[PDB]
Design a protein around this ligand. Structure first.
Ligand SMILES: NCc1ccc(C(F)(F)F)cc1
Ligand SMILES: NCc1ccc(C(F)(F)F)cc1
Length: 330
């Protein structure tokens, strides 16, 4: 079987993408943030502290004839940006774009951090990293992808994120009409539970390609591109007036500048990120200082190929027994 769903940016900056997901019987449709950097499927629900809900659609297990409380199970998660949430666990039917999984763990949020409350467009997260990272205790639970794997025509999903435009998540097949040229596959390490791989180098604008190994994770749930301080300094040195701002928390640049492209290596192939993708607009309304989409990973501890990088490519997440990541231009 296969599934296909459209994913839509939540705002004019592509800060995140939401994808409709059907939960329960009859269906309750929630718009979830598909996150290849985590492994929990959690939702705002009728159980979420009332003051912590501000416009989100909530899941109501009591109105679902297929929902079952998973007795004794709890979950608690903390994201690299400091966000967190926690609650209890149901099992229910979950469908993404025609693809149905029965008995999926649906983690009902009883408490959510402020950054989730303020994001009215995101009803929850759908984790797509490896199931070793799932936070359900005392019995760890499988992701939606792991539960669907056997029924899929091919154990793959693909991410085709749009620049200021809708895109597509496909499960179980590779749309050969959605990319140009060939797909380049590269090895994945699952040892930290992430889709972790090694980029073969980079270039800034029309500059010389620098061959150097950059280990990092493919993370649809992270907005920006976080790379080592040496790489990030080389990029922003090519932008007149750009500087790192401690008060802002990253590189900023004059909103009147034009940004160079950024190229990253996948084996012998090159993915080019157009400079416009790196512009995240003024740091506050009316400011003439703009925030950069390439930032240092020094404070994070791991390099992150977030949406800025991924939306420049057609990306295959191959969950075969030896997992791989495929990248193609589009
Ligand atoms: N998108 C989920 C996510 C967020 C943060 C991290 C970090 F910070 F641990 F790298 C990994 C995965
Ligand atoms: N990387 C996971 C993640 C995704 C979104 C958010 C936000 F936007 F709600 F803060 C936090 C953490």
């Amino acid at each position: 079987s296969t599934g296909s769903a459209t994913t839509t940016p939540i705002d004019s900056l592509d800060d995140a993408y939401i994808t409709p997901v059907q939960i329960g019987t009859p269906a309750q449709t929630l718009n979830l943030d598909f996150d290849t950097g985590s492994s929990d499927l959690w939702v705002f629900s009728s159980e979420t502290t009332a003051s912590e809900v501000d416009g989100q659609t909530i899941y109501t297990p009591s109105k679902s004839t297929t929902a079952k409380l998973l007795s004794g199970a709890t979950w608690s998660i903390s994201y690299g940006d400091g966000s967190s949430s926690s609650g209890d666990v149901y099992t229910d039917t979950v469908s993404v774009g025609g693809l149905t999984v029965t008995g999926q763990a649906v983690e009902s949020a009883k408490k959510v951090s402020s950054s989730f409350t303020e994001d009215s467009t995101i009803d929850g997260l759908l984790g797509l990293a490896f199931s070793t990272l799932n936070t359900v205790s005392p019995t760890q639970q499988k992701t939606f992808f792991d539960n669907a794997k056997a029924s899929l025509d091919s154990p793959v999903f693909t991410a085709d994120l749009g620049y200021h435009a809708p895109g597509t998540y496909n499960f179980g097949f590779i749309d050969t009409t959605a990319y140009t040229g060939s797909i380049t596959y590269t090895a994945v390490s699952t040892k930290q539970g992430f889709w972790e791989w090694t980029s073969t180098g980079y270039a800034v604008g029309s500059g010389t390609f620098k061959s150097t190994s950059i280990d990092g994770i493919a993370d649809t749930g992270t907005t920006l591109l976080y790379l080592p301080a040496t790489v990030v300094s080389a990029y922003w040195a090519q932008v007149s007036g750009a500087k790192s701002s401690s008060s802002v928390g990253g590189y900023v640049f004059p909103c009147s500048a034009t940004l160079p492209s950024f190229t990253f290596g996948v084996g012998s192939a090159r993915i080019v990120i157009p400079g416009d993708y790196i512009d995240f607009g003024p740091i506050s309304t009316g400011s003439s200082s703009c925030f950069g989409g390439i930032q240092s990973s020094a404070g994070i501890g791991i390099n992150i190929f977030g949406d800025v990088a991924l939306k420049a490519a057609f990306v295959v997440f191959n969950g075969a027994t030896t997992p791989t990541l495929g990248f193609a231009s589009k």
